[PDB]
Design a protein around this ligand. Structure first.
Ligand SMILES: Nc1ncnc2c1ncn2[C@@H]1O[C@H](CSCC[C@H](N)C(=O)O)[C@@H](O)[C@H]1O
Ligand SMILES: [Zn+2]
Length: 1064
């Protein structure tokens, strides 16, 4: 007879989304523990048991027991294997109404059968077979349990049908339709609940029909083998998706070696246990207090003489008495808010005067509570911040005078002990006043600027002047004067947004004002136009003549041409003044500057050709005339890099001229060798930062400020005398940068104590550098309900830093990858906090925002999707000149065969003749066939693979279409991008970070070659020059490239620090 198997599409609606198998321990193979298997009846084979088992196909995907025969077949087209811990046949059974000394850990051969035996009701047992023995099953692994539960549900349904076919007795009474009816009426709590719809019920029964069919053969009674239901289910079933195998009785024997996918595969590395971070006691206090609290008629007179006069002729005073209390300039007062439930508001006195008629009036600046800023619940109860907002009220509206001081404290590592003692004294005084219940004393140290996204230092000479003159009032008046169109003089020019436009200037015009990996396609850059005159239409319009870019002729001419080139024309437009975005410069080609930077950073173009729009021909500029091509012409800081990697941030910060990476701490051997290969004068420590900070504190005598574990103490005592003398002591470090792998969970505090952000912050606390830079993923601002970000800010503010936060997009600075990163800048009180770099490339990103509290947001830079100074950068611009390689090419040193054509390929190569690391990961045979059968078009993925059966060189028959996740219902979106190919005219996705060759491939194939992206190609999509060197095996090199901050973005950030270092 023929055995009908129901294909995976019919049974997929019940099983979870596909997932794959991983292990860390070595496994013996099955075939060596047993002798050779000659012709033997399947009755007489070893009987054993398995614990912590799983089942998987040749791609390592989790698979069901319903895809194996219930009986003995001859040929099987499905290759199923497994894992298990071998033990002895003891006799365990599973109870439906509801030990591992590692006998040995094995990986199994081709599974060819399974079986269910019926004990008592609610007690069954399940056994499986390979060609050497019989194996009985026990408790499954945690991750394969979701593929175990649907089998027992069908067991319950079958038991129920037996019960109410015999309970009703007259076994030959119920019919398929009758059973569907009685099943359908069950309540939604019984364990045999299929569905309340007849059609869904019959679907379930027919789809899972072989389990019921065997359970209706091993249930002891000669009353259920001829039932109408039994023969109905078998006569049905055919009208579903099915495969037809042959049932024959045979006599077993091995023929093949173990074709398990795990044969010859190394186990993956461990998940190294987190150890408690080495912190200082200040950081420990800050982070531990939070996690132990949280988530675990009256007279008035002027006092004294007059000081001067405001610029209206009105007297100006300094000290006033509000009924017994004293109010002074520099103090603070509390005003009674409308609703008598919230706390009062506190105002900083700027000046007080007597109005024209007669009044007692003051002008105040708003002092805000740290509870209502981005800090929130992490802020001190006594810390107030200064804002830009002002207020004028009468001196009768006060509730009372607050107690307030401005805290100016000295800076340096040399002062950090005296500070700690003074802080503890103040904390004790605060507790004493709270218990006796006296008033609160407040202090201010910083300035809150929600529109600049940071805490800045106090302008101490600007505040509290008592001269009738307020700085914030000037700033607001200027900001409202800035928003008017001001045609200068009678004519010839104007003012918009603070930019003066004159006649014969070159301007930027918005592209629309003049007329998948694909997101910049259809996105255009500014239109470069020349201003001719001013037309009446006082509100005016402007007359402009335009420039055509290489983009506007064809795509190939844009590939060939420099990115700062423009084509002349004779086209004129009349425009409204509000379409004008900025000013640029256009020179002749010979007048262009000699210095070339990869991030271009300046607004300069050149012209040499003509574009006749009527015929579409490029020709030399008409000698007839020329369009007046106007525009006629030590600070380096000693650096410590923590969590270094291969050096993406240090390369960009050393190129710009601010860093000299003298010390570095990377605990992995491959990344440390890669770092030392490229920065040969740097001292590299391949050690955990928890042991390095312990050694540094031990070298200064400060072993009592250290919170450390004893094993780290022993590791710090196991250092060579040579290594100890090359350590950074506090005093010699002026700049600290780092990429800590901060995480997200909840804690238990016990589970938060093991986080690497605490050790980084302790490095900042011990060394106290001039500048501090933190980089991390964009999700950092939303980990743990925003608590890690809030606590990081509060920790940096307890020391005395200025802090600034922002999210930046790398594609707007010159790369083909869309990497979003979060940056925190910290500077001493007496420095200048670096600005943010200007994005000059067009990218399709919607303006990344950080949520300040109380309904406000902040965004650091602009969005360039509607127009930017330069043209986007494509895949052909990045990898178009590299030679052709094949699957699994290991040759590290090759040669260049073509020359550069595009601007990017002339920046990246330079004067390099040796092509290193143009190697790719090897795909096995079945994945290679699928990669060769994918079309070379934009947006081609696994939906393009024909449904077919592939025969390999082993004799294995496999399936062309990989993961099966439709489950024909929502909970998936088609899984677009898996087994995907890139687009020549698009950009690199952020899924080529560590391409995987086996299970869930992703979008990593070459646009025309049948292979995965090479290491060199992934290095060029982040801006790494062709001379940069990597180290390790291929996996470590891909990891080193994936973790890095792009060197172009790091150059732009470091060039803004070099401007801040000149302004001091
Ligand atoms: N406890 C620890 N001590 C030192 N290094 C660690 C560490 N835990 C992780 N690391 C290393 O720190 C690095 C964090 S990635 C930092 C990336 C770096 N910005 C760059 O520019 O390339 C990883 O390479 C990791 O290997
Ligand atoms: Zn003011």
């Amino acid at each position: 007879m023929f055995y009908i198997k129901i294909n995976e599409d019919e049974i997929a609606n019940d099983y979870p989304l596909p997932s794959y198998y991983k292990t860390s321990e070595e496994e013996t193979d099955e075939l060596i523990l047993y002798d050779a298997s000659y012709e033997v009846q399947s009755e007489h084979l070893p009987h054993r048991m398995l614990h912590n088992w799983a089942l998987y196909n040749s791609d390592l995907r989790f698979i069901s027991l319903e895809l194996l025969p219930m009986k003995q077949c001859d040929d099987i087209d499905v290759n199923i294997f497994g894992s298990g811990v071998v033990t002895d046949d003891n006799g365990s059974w599973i109870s439906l109404n509801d030990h591992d000394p590692d006998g040995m850990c094995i990986f199994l051969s081709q599974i060819k059968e399974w079986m269910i035996e019926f004990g008592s009701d609610d007690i069954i047992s399940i056994s499986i077979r390979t060609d050497v023995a019989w194996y009985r099953l026990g408790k499954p692994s945690k991750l394969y349990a979701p593929w175990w539960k649907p089998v027992l549900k069908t067991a319950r349904v079958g038991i129920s049908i037996l019960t109410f076919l015999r309970v009703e007795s007259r076994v030959a009474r119920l019919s398929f339709a009758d059973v569907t009816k009685r099943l359908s009426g069950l309540q939604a709590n019984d364990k045999a609940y299929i569905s309340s719809d007849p059609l869904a019920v019959e679907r379930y029964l027919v789809v899972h029909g072989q389990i019921i069919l065997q359970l209706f053969a091993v249930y002891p009674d000669d009353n259920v083998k001829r039932c109408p239901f039994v023969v109905g289910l078998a006569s049905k079933l055919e009208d579903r998706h099915h495969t037809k195998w042959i049932i024959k009785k045979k006599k077993i024997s091995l023929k093949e070696l173990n074709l398990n996918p795990r044969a010859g595969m190394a186990p993956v590395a461990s998940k190294r246990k987190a150890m408690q971070a080495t912190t200082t006691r200040l950081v420990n206090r800050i982070w531990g207090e939070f996690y132990s609290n949280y988530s675990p008629k009256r007279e008035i007179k002027w006092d004294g003489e007059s000081l001067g006069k405001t610029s209206a002729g009105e007297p100006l005073y300094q000290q006033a008495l509000v009924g017994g209390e004293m109010v002074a300039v520099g103090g603070a007062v509390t005003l009674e808010v409308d609703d008598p439930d919230e706390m009062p508001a506190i105002y900083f006195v700027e000046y007080m005067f007597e109005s024209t008629d007669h009044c007692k009036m003051l002008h105040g600046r708003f002092l805000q509570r740290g509870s209502m800023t981005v800090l929130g619940n992490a802020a001190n109860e006594r810390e107030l911040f200064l804002t830009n907002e002002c207020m004028t009220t009468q001196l009768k509206d006060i509730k009372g005078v607050a107690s307030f001081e401005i805290r100016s404290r000295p800076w340096g590592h040399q002062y950090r002990k005296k500070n700690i003692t003074a802080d503890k004294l103040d904390w004790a005084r605060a507790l004493e006043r709270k218990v006796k219940d006296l008033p609160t004393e407040y202090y201010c140290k910083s300035l809150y600027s929600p529109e600049r996204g940071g805490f800045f230092s106090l302008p101490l000479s600007d505040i509290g002047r008592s001269s009738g003159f307020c700085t914030s009032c000037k700033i607001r008046e200027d900001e409202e004067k800035r928003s008017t169109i001001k045609l200068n003089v009678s004519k010839t020019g104007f003012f918009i947004n603070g930019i003066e436009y004159s006649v014969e200037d070159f301007v930027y015009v918005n592209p629309d004002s003049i007329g998948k990996s694909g997101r910049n396609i259809g996105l255009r850059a500014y239109v470069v136009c020349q201003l001719l005159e001013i037309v009446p239409k006082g509100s005016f319009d402007v007359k402009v003549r335009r420039f055509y870019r290489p983009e506007d002729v064809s795509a190939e001419k844009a590939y060939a041409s420099d990115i700062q080139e423009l084509y002349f024309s004779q086209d004129t437009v009349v425009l409204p003044p509000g379409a004008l975005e900025g000013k640029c410069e256009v020179r002749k080609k010979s007048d262009m500057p000699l210095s070339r930077e990869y991030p271009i950073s300046d607004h300069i173009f050149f012209c040499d050709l003509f574009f006749d729009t009527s015929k579409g021909s490029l020709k030399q500029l008409p000698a007839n005339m020329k369009p007046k091509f106007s525009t006629i012409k030590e600070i380096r800081l000693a650096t410590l890099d923590i969590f270094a990697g291969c050096g993406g941030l240090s390369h960009g910060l050393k190129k710009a001229g601010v860093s000299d990476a003298k010390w570095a701490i990377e605990y992995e051997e491959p990344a440390g060798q890669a770092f030392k290969q490229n920065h040969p004068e740097s001292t590299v420590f391949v050690d955990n930062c928890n042991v390095i900070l312990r050694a540094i504190m031990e070298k200064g005598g400060d072993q009592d400020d250290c919170v450390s574990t004893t094993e780290a103490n022993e590791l710090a005592a196991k250092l060579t005398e040579e290594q100890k003398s090359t350590l950074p002591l506090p005093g010699q470090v002026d700049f600290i940068n780092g990429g800590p792998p901060c995480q997200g969970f909840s804690g238990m505090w016990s589970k938060v104590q093991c986080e690497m952000i605490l050790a980084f912050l302790s490095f900042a606390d011990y060394f106290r550098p001039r500048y501090f830079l933190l980089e991390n993923v964009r999700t950092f601002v939303s980990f743990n309900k925003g608590q890690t970000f809030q606590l990081t800010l509060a920790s940096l503010l307890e020391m005395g830093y200025q802090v600034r936060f922002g999210i930046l997009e790398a594609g707007a600075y010159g790369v083909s990858q869309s990497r979003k990163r979060a940056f925190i800048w910290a500077a001493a009180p007496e420095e200048v906090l670096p600005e943010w770099p200007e994005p000059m490339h067009v990218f399709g990103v919607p303006k990344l925002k950080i949520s300040l509290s109380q309904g406000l947001h902040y965004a650091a830079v602009r969005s360039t999707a509607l127009g930017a100074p330069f043209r986007p950068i494509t895949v052909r611009d990045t990898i178009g000149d590299l030679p052709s390689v094949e699957n699994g090419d290991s040759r590290t040193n090759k040669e260049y065969k073509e020359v550069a054509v595009s601007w990017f390929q002339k920046e990246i190569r330079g004067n390099t003749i040796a092509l290193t690391d143009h190697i790719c990961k090897a795909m096995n045979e079945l994945n290679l066939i699928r990669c060769k059968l994918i079309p070379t078009r934009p947006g081609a993925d696994w939906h393009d693979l024909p449904k077919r059966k592939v025969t390999l060189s082993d004799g294995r028959v496999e399936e062309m279409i990989p993961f099966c996740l439709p489950n024909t219902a929502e909970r998936h979106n088609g899984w677009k991008g898996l087994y995907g190919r890139l687009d020549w005219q698009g950009n690199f996705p952020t899924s080529v970070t560590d391409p995987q060759p086996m299970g869930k491939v992703g979008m990593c194939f070459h646009p025309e070659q049948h292979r995965i992206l090479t290491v060199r190609e992934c290095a060029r999509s982040q801006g790494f020059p062709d001379s940069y060197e990597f180290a390790g095996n291929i996996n470590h090199k891909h990891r080193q490239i994936g973790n890095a901050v792009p060197p172009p973005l790091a150059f732009a950030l470091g060039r803004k620090l070099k401007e801040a270092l000149h302004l001091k």
